[PDB]
Design an enzyme around this catalytic site. Structure first.
Site, mmCIF file in Angstrom:
data_model
loop_
_atom_site.group_PDB
_atom_site.id
_atom_site.type_symbol
_atom_site.label_atom_id
_atom_site.label_comp_id
_atom_site.label_asym_id
_atom_site.label_seq_id
_atom_site.Cartn_x
_atom_site.Cartn_y
_atom_site.Cartn_z
ATOM 1 N N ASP A 195 -1.276 -5.144 -1.991
ATOM 2 C CA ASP A 195 -1.328 -3.957 -1.575
ATOM 3 C C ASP A 195 -0.065 -3.004 -2.123
ATOM 4 O O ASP A 195 -0.149 -1.766 -2.591
ATOM 5 C CB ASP A 195 -1.469 -3.695 0.051
ATOM 6 C CG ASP A 195 -2.985 -3.831 0.348
ATOM 7 O OD1 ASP A 195 -3.932 -4.204 -0.417
ATOM 8 O OD2 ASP A 195 -3.277 -3.453 1.547
ATOM 9 N N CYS A 213 -9.527 0.032 -12.109
ATOM 10 C CA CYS A 213 -8.628 -0.402 -10.771
ATOM 11 C C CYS A 213 -9.113 0.813 -9.797
ATOM 12 O O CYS A 213 -10.267 1.261 -9.934
ATOM 13 C CB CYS A 213 -7.157 -0.458 -10.856
ATOM 14 S SG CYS A 213 -6.257 0.663 -12.029
ATOM 15 N N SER A 214 -8.166 1.378 -9.281
ATOM 16 C CA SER A 214 -8.699 2.698 -8.487
ATOM 17 C C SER A 214 -8.515 3.805 -9.351
ATOM 18 O O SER A 214 -9.468 4.681 -9.677
ATOM 19 C CB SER A 214 -7.655 3.080 -7.208
ATOM 20 O OG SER A 214 -8.395 4.029 -6.487
ATOM 21 N N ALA A 215 -7.429 4.283 -9.986
ATOM 22 C CA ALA A 215 -7.356 5.352 -11.038
ATOM 23 C C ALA A 215 -7.658 4.991 -12.386
ATOM 24 O O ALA A 215 -7.891 5.996 -13.247
ATOM 25 C CB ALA A 215 -5.866 5.929 -10.797
ATOM 26 N N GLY A 216 -7.638 3.730 -12.628
ATOM 27 C CA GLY A 216 -7.802 3.192 -13.942
ATOM 28 C C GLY A 216 -6.610 3.430 -15.058
ATOM 29 O O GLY A 216 -6.833 3.630 -16.290
ATOM 30 N N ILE A 217 -5.225 3.381 -14.747
ATOM 31 C CA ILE A 217 -3.972 3.597 -15.465
ATOM 32 C C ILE A 217 -3.001 2.494 -15.294
ATOM 33 O O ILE A 217 -2.328 2.248 -15.998
ATOM 34 C CB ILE A 217 -3.501 5.178 -15.330
ATOM 35 C CG1 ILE A 217 -3.244 5.422 -13.842
ATOM 36 C CG2 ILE A 217 -4.583 6.113 -15.802
ATOM 37 C CD1 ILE A 217 -2.518 6.881 -13.961
ATOM 38 N N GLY A 218 -2.944 2.072 -13.852
ATOM 39 C CA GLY A 218 -1.825 1.343 -13.488
ATOM 40 C C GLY A 218 -2.108 -0.129 -13.589
ATOM 41 O O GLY A 218 -1.479 -0.737 -14.779
ATOM 42 N N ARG A 219 -2.556 -1.049 -12.924
ATOM 43 C CA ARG A 219 -2.937 -2.294 -13.018
ATOM 44 C C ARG A 219 -3.998 -2.350 -14.437
ATOM 45 O O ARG A 219 -3.734 -3.397 -15.306
ATOM 46 C CB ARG A 219 -3.892 -2.805 -11.757
ATOM 47 C CG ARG A 219 -3.102 -2.847 -10.441
ATOM 48 C CD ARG A 219 -3.968 -3.397 -9.444
ATOM 49 N NE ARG A 219 -3.423 -2.804 -8.191
ATOM 50 C CZ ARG A 219 -3.740 -3.087 -6.774
ATOM 51 N NH1 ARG A 219 -5.141 -3.349 -6.826
ATOM 52 N NH2 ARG A 219 -3.179 -2.575 -5.928
ATOM 53 N N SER A 220 -4.765 -1.624 -14.589
ATOM 54 C CA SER A 220 -5.571 -1.445 -16.038
ATOM 55 C C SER A 220 -4.835 -1.413 -17.134
ATOM 56 O O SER A 220 -4.875 -2.007 -18.055
ATOM 57 C CB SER A 220 -6.665 -0.325 -15.934
ATOM 58 O OG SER A 220 -7.721 -0.348 -14.872
ATOM 59 N N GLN A 260 2.080 2.578 -14.192
ATOM 60 C CA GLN A 260 2.353 3.619 -13.230
ATOM 61 C C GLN A 260 3.640 3.720 -12.544
ATOM 62 O O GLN A 260 4.276 4.605 -11.882
ATOM 63 C CB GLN A 260 1.288 3.396 -12.036
ATOM 64 C CG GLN A 260 0.193 4.244 -12.360
ATOM 65 C CD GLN A 260 -0.992 4.159 -11.294
ATOM 66 O OE1 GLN A 260 -1.248 3.179 -10.883
ATOM 67 N NE2 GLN A 260 -1.129 5.367 -10.543
HETATM 68 C C1 LIG Z 1 -2.628 10.316 -8.549
HETATM 69 C C2 LIG Z 1 -2.832 8.758 -8.695
HETATM 70 C C3 LIG Z 1 -2.967 8.136 -7.950
HETATM 71 C C4 LIG Z 1 -3.100 6.552 -8.098
HETATM 72 C C5 LIG Z 1 -2.546 6.126 -9.394
HETATM 73 S S1 LIG Z 1 -2.691 4.508 -9.763
HETATM 74 C C6 LIG Z 1 -0.958 4.158 -9.147
HETATM 75 N N1 LIG Z 1 -0.349 5.199 -8.581
HETATM 76 C C7 LIG Z 1 0.726 5.151 -8.164
HETATM 77 C C8 LIG Z 1 1.546 3.953 -8.099
HETATM 78 C C9 LIG Z 1 0.928 2.565 -8.816
HETATM 79 C C10 LIG Z 1 -0.416 2.697 -9.173
HETATM 80 C C11 LIG Z 1 -1.099 1.758 -9.881
HETATM 81 O O1 LIG Z 1 -1.242 1.826 -11.049
HETATM 82 O O2 LIG Z 1 -1.338 0.639 -9.415
HETATM 83 C C12 LIG Z 1 -2.007 7.113 -10.105
HETATM 84 C C13 LIG Z 1 -2.184 8.382 -10.072
#
Ligand SMILES: Cc1ccc(Sc2ncccc2C(=O)O)cc1
Ligand SMILES: Cc1ccc(Sc2ncccc2C(=O)O)cc1
Length: 299
Positions: free
Chosen positions: A181, A215-222, A262
């Site tokens: 988490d 993932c949730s936003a599709g930029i970090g883990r992805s 991220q």
């Molecule tokens: C607004 C916004 C929300 C969510 C994410 S994904 C993320 N955000 C913060 C830290 C880590 C991540 C991750 O990639 O896990 C990015 C932007």
């Protein structure tokens, strides 16, 4: 510089935040005007994460062709990926429409449906064989065929049917279930074992459409998944593997979707994964079995 010793030099000097901020400063900025139209507000999970216009995936629909998804096309590595947000209650039908239209074989999911006590994406696939899902807005039917639950990830076989033409296709769902988490995993061994299972399935190969990863936003883990995969492929293709520059590869990928990787911790973890993965590849084929063991995927 090489990777493994650049790595130790950043650790000893404690400068990961400064390296990561440099990447943020140099990253591309392209317009995302379609994402910001008022009619698309309930198609975006986060107001500050949007696909660029030039690389966004278009739905084959004349009313509204918008989905929050981007095509990452890596020319030298000869790999493509679609990176997308976790589907929302009002975009699960769009999500499967994209999978169908882009001829994808696999979907890679790097989050749990609930994390930190809050919903991170919709329950967008069926959990029981006898309870299929119908998406009426896009005229698709989705059936669970089989499920294999392992210690760090689950693989599902799904059947997607286009109800308009009665055509059917087999989709593989690769679900990494153990990302913590908070923070990143302590060892990259289970993440690399997972990447290799996706590879072994054919889902990343040129005879299929691009893999869909979220993932949730599709930029970090992805971003971590596609960055590690592309860097390892370039190390196999080139005469000089030590010429692969992970920061340069990341900046290339950020031409196609904003915000990939991220946190400075995700950047350090990506270095770790590529470093350990390059040892198992060689020529050391045995390292693959080692990762599997160290991942303790059984149960
Ligand atoms: C607004 C916004 C929300 C969510 C994410 S994904 C993320 N955000 C913060 C830290 C880590 C991540 C991750 O990639 O896990 C990015 C932007
Ligand atoms: C379009 C499509 C075709 C086939 C399959 S696999 C399958 N289907 C029914 C029984 C058994 C299997 C099995 O693979 O064992 C999945 C999707």
């Amino acid at each position: 510089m090489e990777m493994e010793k650049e790595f130790e030099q950043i650790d000893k000097s404690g400068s990961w935040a400064a390296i990561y901020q440099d990447i943020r400063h140099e990253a591309s900025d392209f317009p995302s005007r379609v994402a910001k139209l008022p009619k698309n507000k309930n198609r975006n999970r986060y107001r500050d994460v949007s696909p660029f216009d030039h690389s966004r995936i278009k739905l084959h629909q004349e009313d509204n062709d918008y989905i929050n998804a981007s095509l990452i096309k890596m020319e030298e590595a000869q790999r493509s990926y679609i990176l997308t947000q976790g589907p929302l209650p009002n975009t699960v039908g769009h999500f499967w429409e994209m999978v169908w239209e882009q001829k994808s074989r696999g979907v890679v999911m790097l989050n749990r449906v609930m994390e930190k006590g809050s919903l991170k994406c919709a329950q967008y696939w069926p959990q029981k064989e006898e309870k299929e899902m119908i998406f009426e807005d896009t005229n698709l039917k989705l059936t669970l065929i089989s499920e294999d639950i392992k210690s760090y990830y689950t693989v599902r076989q799904l059947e997607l049917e286009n109800l308009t033409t009665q055509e059917t296709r087999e989709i593989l769902h690769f679900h990494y279930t153990t990302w913590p988490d908070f923070g990143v995993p302590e060892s990259p061994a289970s993440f690399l074992n997972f990447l290799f299972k996706v590879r072994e399935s054919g889902s990343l190969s040129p005879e299929h459409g691009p893999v869909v990863v979220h993932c949730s936003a599709g930029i970090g883990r992805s971003g971590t998944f596609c960055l590690a995969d592309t860097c390892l492929l370039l190390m196999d293709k080139r005469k000089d593997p030590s010429s692969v520059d992970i920061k340069k590869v990341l900046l290339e990928m950020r031409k196609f979707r904003m915000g990939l990787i991220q946190t400075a911790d995700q950047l350090r973890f990506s270095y770790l994964a590529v470093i350990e993965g390059a040892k198992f590849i060689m020529g050391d084929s045995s390292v693959q079995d080692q990762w599997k063991e160290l991942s303790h995927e059984d149960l």
